[PDB]
Amino acid sequence: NSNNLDSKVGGNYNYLYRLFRKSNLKPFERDISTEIYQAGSTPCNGVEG
Amino acid sequence: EVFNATRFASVYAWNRKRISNCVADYSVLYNSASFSTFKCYGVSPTKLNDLCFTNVYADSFVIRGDEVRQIAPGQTGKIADYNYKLPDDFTGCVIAWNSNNLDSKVGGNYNYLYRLFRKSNLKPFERDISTEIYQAGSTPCNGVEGFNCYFPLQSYGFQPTNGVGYQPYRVVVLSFELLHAPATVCGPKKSTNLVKNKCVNFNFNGLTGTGVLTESNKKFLPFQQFGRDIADTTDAVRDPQTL
Amino acid sequence: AYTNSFTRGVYYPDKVFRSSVLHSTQDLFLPFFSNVTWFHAIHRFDNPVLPFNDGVYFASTEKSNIIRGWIFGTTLDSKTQSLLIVNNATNVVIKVCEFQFCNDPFLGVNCTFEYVSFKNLREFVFKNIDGYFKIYSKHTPINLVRDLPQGFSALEPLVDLPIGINITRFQTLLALHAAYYVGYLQPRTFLLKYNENGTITDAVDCALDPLSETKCTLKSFTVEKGIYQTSNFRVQPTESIVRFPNITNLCPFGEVFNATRFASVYAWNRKRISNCVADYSVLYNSASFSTFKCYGVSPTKLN
Amino acid sequence: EILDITPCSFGGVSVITPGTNTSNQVAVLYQDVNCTEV
Amino acid sequence: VQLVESGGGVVQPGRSLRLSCAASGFTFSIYGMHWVRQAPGKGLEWVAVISYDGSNKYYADSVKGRFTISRDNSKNTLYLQMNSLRAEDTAVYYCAKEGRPSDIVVVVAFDYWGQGTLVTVSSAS
Amino acid sequence: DIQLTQSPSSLSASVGDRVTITCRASQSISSYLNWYQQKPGKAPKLLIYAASSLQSGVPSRFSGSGSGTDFTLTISSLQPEDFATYYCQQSYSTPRTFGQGTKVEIK
Amino acid sequence: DIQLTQSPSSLSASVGDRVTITCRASQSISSYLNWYQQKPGKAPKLLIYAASSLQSGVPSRFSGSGSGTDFTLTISSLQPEDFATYYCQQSYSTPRTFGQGTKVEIK
Amino acid sequence: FGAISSVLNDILSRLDPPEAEVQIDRLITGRLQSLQTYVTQQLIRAAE
Amino acid sequence: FGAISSVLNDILSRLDPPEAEVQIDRLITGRLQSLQTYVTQQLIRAAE
Ligand SMILES: *[C@@H]1O[C@H](CO)[C@@H](O[C@@H]2O[C@H](CO)[C@@H](O)[C@H](O)[C@H]2NC(C)=O)[C@H](O)[C@H]1NC(C)=O
Ligand SMILES: *[C@@H]1O[C@H](CO)[C@@H](O)[C@H](O)[C@H]1NC(C)=O
Ligand SMILES: *[C@@H]1O[C@H](CO)[C@@H](O)[C@H](O)[C@H]1NC(C)=O
Ligand SMILES: *[C@@H]1O[C@H](CO)[C@@H](O)[C@H](O)[C@H]1NC(C)=O
Ligand SMILES: *[C@@H]1O[C@H](CO)[C@@H](O)[C@H](O)[C@H]1NC(C)=O
Ligand SMILES: *[C@@H]1O[C@H](CO)[C@@H](O)[C@H](O)[C@H]1NC(C)=O
Ligand SMILES: *[C@@H]1O[C@H](CO)[C@@H](O)[C@H](O)[C@H]1NC(C)=O
């Protein structure tokens, strides 16, 4: 753990998550594609909410 | 309606709504981020959409966070040994997501029960609603109070301020029974027409496999579906769309 | 009264189309040559409640369509879930309410699922399995009025329906202004001879008699002259002597569990216990203890 | 006390039959058991 | 969770009275119900115990025969019929919920109580 | 039967004082005492169960201990709102009895 | 579009009062309301999201609920610092709107 | 042969490779054992 | 045969089914090969 060096005093927000993506990730594949998530129902590209 | 239910039942007496003869569509159903645990045992969850089952089973109830890991094949624990018991050969899988959204309003929720110790371990798939009393070796009973006659049904004290492992996880477990019977439930895949006298890969009612399909002079009985060979290999099927 | 269930009772166990195949299956069947309790519908008499079982064979000779109904309940008194099947003039009715049944429940001449539709044998085999209720049927005509006819008619599966109960008691419904038979199935192994079309024409009970065991072993109806080894004899142990040593001194677990000065982790106690009658079962029959996970021996059996 | 344990009697069961098409009378042979355990 | 005690007041000696204990907020049909009196100036005194279904009801020797506590799980309300009231019966009365703390230790303890109602057995008016 | 004995029957103390109240049972119950606080004119509040365990929402200065027949309720630092009547309640068996009540007041 | 109507528009209550503020949507959103507390002259503060889920650092007396169109924010015991203007905010779709604001005052 | 199902397509169809192997490897070991016994039977019968 | 104990009753007694299966399945496979070997020994020696 790295509390001594991270989470300084108010919530460190510099580290990310990459939550759900369309398909399961193949081994040793770093993915940086952050276009948006779609969730079946067509509406996108007005990306909010 | 199962997942959008309004009154989840307590764990000691779980609902067992049955689903059959309908076109299930699992893939979109779990294509939502709400569900927190989705461990599937008998079937890889992705392929759920493809299979055909004879019958399924929707069992739902409410438990705290720590017990959700317990609901599983080959598990032991308080709810595991006393409320809901899965056979080792469980074919199906479990669903989990919290309901602090909907439960433990602000002052101590007491509408969900526990079914603590009972005389003997619970056999798989048995809802037990018999809470008359416990005995604890030392005889004096039917004077129901206080010493070594301890009431079996505890209640959950559900609080909005209850940590993360004590919160109410609404769960629902699907158990598929897969047999060589007319499959009532199936995924949502439309079908092509029939091509005969030709080497075609074929899937009938979810049977699967390839072959050369030709008309048969043999006379099935009305109820029979699947012709079979002396070596117990499929050789004849009845076309579902047209008999 | 009793009589002989000569050969009746075989039903297509599943959905298959074997042609000229001798197929061995193990399932609930009416054992051959069994005693079936034979109930009358003459003169006073009545149709008593009959115990259900893993399965029930119901064969009735009928000449005037008196018999119309069946009852399948645990209590049969509206306390507990109760199925009904009745056939009035042209309609077949199945209901599963918690019905208030008459002590003499007869058809004179929280509710749930419903569906609606001597010269005669309306043979039926009512079996309840794995939360599913199955009904099998056949309508062979006969002219022998006295008793059951020898012969072999297979039973096609009429209907299947999903109730899922403890059905443990049974009664029938007669039209009141026609004898019927009852047999109880058993988990026997049968060898069924499918014909060319698939009509079962003959079958043999694998356990009826020494000759019949061979037919299953050879997997043939006709067996040639000779000696055939079939099964293995075993003398079942009758008593089970529980002999353990004779020393009387209870092991000192109590002081360990009722200790006052538990030692620290780095310097943990190592109290040794031996030469005594330990009693693990009552020891851990208390709900204080939080973790009991046992590796080398299943916890219950320790005693 | 000095005790011997001898495993309980067991043998194969053989069925003597004339060919069925002649008859159905059948006699049974129990292998290597005394005629008391039957 | 609210427990409603009511039915106290001024009563002449030797008379009778029925007290009410209304249950709300929890599955009342699953817990024993107790009445406990506290007479003015002195402490708490256990009075009566009933089963979760009312099928088993017990009292203290000070009140046996005189008092009859009742239960109606259909509407989930508790009652106590005191007959032949006297000056010693003048006391505030508590109906208290039974049950155990949130989960295992052993003990069954007195959790959430009522609010108290005085039953003053007095000839004055 | 079971008899509950408290000592002292009453006392007074100043703010911050360590108070100790003893409840002795007729016989060995060892697991069943319950400490309740009653402010006058209001309903009692459960404080301690099993004679050594603390109820949620109660300040940590409250503390309980004991087993067998000897039981104790202690407060490390008395506070201006502590001052009330405390009853020990055994739950070993029916009919459950109480102590004689102990009122702690100001000085 | 989506419209939010609150009730009451404003109110006053004494300390400890259970105050309830209702927000109805134009149509069924059922998961997207957000309760924000704005003191006068300062920036609004998040209290509740998804119309029934609590934001950390918010006192427990704060409580929200609802689904479909009917939503409510409830406070068990009103406190000297709770008096402010509260806005329900749906997140169902753009343009994400607010209610008309509910000011809590002292009487 | 101590696997969930005899029909190979099922195991291949329902559950995905990473745990499917543990299921097939019992089918292979069992089936391969059966075929090997048959051959040794034929070889001996061939000599006769 | 690479199991906890050669005696069947031990692994039968001491452990309940869920773990017993993996232990027994090793014994059965081990015994079965031993019986398989013996028969093939007899058949070959029978020919001679
Ligand atoms: C269905 O109902 C029967 C009652 O007719 C149940 O059988 C009882 O089981 C208990 C088990 O503890 C026995 O002690 C009783 O003796 C049985 N009854 C009789 C009359 O002997 C049966 O358990 C119920 N079904 C299931 C699945 O439990
Ligand atoms: C059938 O019942 C008769 C008496 O009617 C009895 O002698 C016979 O042994 C019984 N046989 C069987 C198989 O139950
Ligand atoms: C037959 O019985 C059913 C049982 O519900 C009843 O509703 C019906 O009226 C009866 N008659 C006919 C003609 O169906
Ligand atoms: C219907 O079912 C409920 C389920 O708890 C039961 O309480 C009720 O008694 C049943 N109705 C009747 C008439 O028994
Ligand atoms: C099969 O059925 C046909 C008529 O459906 C009949 O002509 C034929 O004899 C039957 N064969 C057998 C073996 O039953
Ligand atoms: C065998 O039985 C058939 C009839 O089933 C008969 O025609 C034939 O003559 C019999 N053969 C012998 C050798 O008995
Ligand atoms: C069976 O036991 C009797 C004594 O009871 C003995 O005479 C006989 O020889 C025994 N049979 C054999 C085959 O040893």
PDB file of N, CA and C in Angstrom, chain B residues 3 83 124 144 157 177 219 228 230:
ATOM      1  N   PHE B   3     -36.695  -8.678 -11.297  1.00  0.00           N
ATOM      2  CA  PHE B   3     -35.643  -7.752 -10.906  1.00  0.00           C
ATOM      3  C   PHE B   3     -36.205  -6.389 -10.533  1.00  0.00           C
ATOM      4  N   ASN B  83     -30.370 -21.399   5.600  1.00  0.00           N
ATOM      5  CA  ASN B  83     -31.400 -20.723   4.830  1.00  0.00           C
ATOM      6  C   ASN B  83     -31.506 -21.204   3.397  1.00  0.00           C
ATOM      7  N   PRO B 124     -30.531 -29.163   0.290  1.00  0.00           N
ATOM      8  CA  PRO B 124     -30.568 -28.202  -0.820  1.00  0.00           C
ATOM      9  C   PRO B 124     -31.972 -27.929  -1.338  1.00  0.00           C
ATOM     10  N   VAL B 144     -42.178 -21.100  26.316  1.00  0.00           N
ATOM     11  CA  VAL B 144     -41.258 -20.541  25.334  1.00  0.00           C
ATOM     12  C   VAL B 144     -40.704 -19.207  25.818  1.00  0.00           C
ATOM     13  N   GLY B 157     -30.907  -5.867  11.564  1.00  0.00           N
ATOM     14  CA  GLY B 157     -31.005  -4.454  11.850  1.00  0.00           C
ATOM     15  C   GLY B 157     -30.383  -3.694  10.703  1.00  0.00           C
ATOM     16  N   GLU B 177     -32.337 -26.091 -15.166  1.00  0.00           N
ATOM     17  CA  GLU B 177     -32.412 -27.543 -15.241  1.00  0.00           C
ATOM     18  C   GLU B 177     -32.381 -27.931 -16.715  1.00  0.00           C
ATOM     19  N   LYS B 219     -42.745 -43.351 -38.694  1.00  0.00           N
ATOM     20  CA  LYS B 219     -43.909 -42.682 -38.118  1.00  0.00           C
ATOM     21  C   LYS B 219     -43.691 -42.484 -36.624  1.00  0.00           C
ATOM     22  N   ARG B 228     -33.828 -41.685 -31.875  1.00  0.00           N
ATOM     23  CA  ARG B 228     -32.561 -42.073 -31.285  1.00  0.00           C
ATOM     24  C   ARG B 228     -32.157 -43.416 -31.864  1.00  0.00           C
ATOM     25  N   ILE B 230     -29.812 -47.218 -31.930  1.00  0.00           N
ATOM     26  CA  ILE B 230     -29.485 -48.333 -31.046  1.00  0.00           C
ATOM     27  C   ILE B 230     -28.207 -48.027 -30.275  1.00  0.00           C
TER      28      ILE B 230
END
